Design a binder for this molecule. Sequence first.
Ligand SMILES: [Zn+2]
Length: 197
Amino acid sequence: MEILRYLMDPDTFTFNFNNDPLVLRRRQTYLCYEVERLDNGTWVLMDQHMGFLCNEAKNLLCGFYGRHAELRFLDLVPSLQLDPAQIYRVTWFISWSPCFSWGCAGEVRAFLQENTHVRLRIFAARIYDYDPLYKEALQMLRDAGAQVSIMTYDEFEYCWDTFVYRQGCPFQPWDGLEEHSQALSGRLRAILQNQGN
Ligand SMILES: [Zn+2]
């Protein structure tokens, strides 16, 4: 009886998050999921229930279609053996924005209701230009009870130091990390409204 982890690698973590200024394809995506247990009135990160999810994973032997880490999650949550007694809260760290509601987000909503004991917080690093539909899908998401926002500097460090282990070395993105946090913020935050049709 032992535990099972994975801890993504740096070269990959940085790369996958590096990509390029604009998007590439509505297929290559990477989301980082974690689990927190409110202990002593504070949130505590649990490594035994933490990990990252990619596009294609297990259950592929069935020849199923569509590969989104968001979906894979909804399937792995049961593995976290949650409980309706205590209070949990998972955090999603994606180097991009959701694809669509009825697609991915829509699913996250149905799940948010199924398990009200566990809350879900989303955090995107960049906005999808080739897919400006995620906006509407988002509004529907926050409505599910979850909360979304833009990744900050200190935030990235938490994920980099948490998910990627490297002699406890500091995080190193590029240079426009902050400059982006402000710019993107204005955009995302502004999109968190989208009214007047
Ligand atoms: Zn999707």
